[PDB]
């Protein structure tokens, strides 16, 4: 019955990957939308000193956001998935590729 | 109450791009599992003449995997993604970016 596992394993993966480029296509585009309200958002609180301070925390928190680091250091990881489906660069010496110095002669 | 927004999206997002590297990662190793089972599967074949016959078609379907070369081609989307959030590398302006053999001399 291995032609079942065949089918169910591919159908698995198939699934996996084209959600996968769904998702993150999905995340540049809500990034652009976020980028723009919260840029007319502003004008609209610079009319009123208590809305002014709602968004003075609010944007240092977007420059502090330690979140949003979070999601650029995710694209980070598939970059090195990229690097190991297709190596290219590849630095891998089949020697002792250490690069050792001693010298310095005493008694 | 604007915090059950952010709290939401912010668990949407952040869950499934953990997860989003998680699949990739799974992925890759699918990949190297099928490779070695075909490998296995034709050595067994070789000792039997309808065997062989099977395994004459079978690793032929699979040199020739469309499906294997879908998610090779999926892997570059995302490659493009990444130049899209952030190019760097590439530059692109107005401008002629291209340098043509020409003189250009100090004169």
């Known amino acids: 019955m291995s032609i079942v596992s065949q089918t169910r394993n591919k159908e698995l993966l198939l699934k996996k990957i084209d959600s996968l480029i769904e998702a993150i296509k999905k995340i540049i585009a809500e990034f652009?939308?976020?980028?723009?309200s919260v840029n007319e958002l502003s004008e609209?609180?610079?009319?009123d000193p208590?809305?002014?301070?709602?968004?003075?925390?609010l944007i240092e928190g977007y420059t502090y956001g330690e979140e949003r680091?979070?999601?650029?250091?995710?694209?980070?990881?598939?970059?090195?998935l990229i690097e190991?489906?297709?190596?290219?660069?590849?630095?891998?010496?089949?020697?002792?590729?250490?690069?050792?110095?001693?010298?310095?002669?005493?008694?």
Request: charged fraction near 35%; proline fraction near 2%.
């Open 69 to 80: 680091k979070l999601y650029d250091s995710a694209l980070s990881k598939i970059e090195k």
């Open 84 to 107: 190991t489906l297709s190596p290219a660069r590849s630095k891998s010496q089949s020697t002792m590729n250490q690069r050792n110095r001693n010298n310095r002669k005493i008694v």
């Open 44 to 47: 609209k609180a610079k009319t």
């Open 32 to 36: 652009d939308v976020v980028k723009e």
């Open 50 to 57: 208590q809305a002014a301070e709602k968004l003075n925390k």
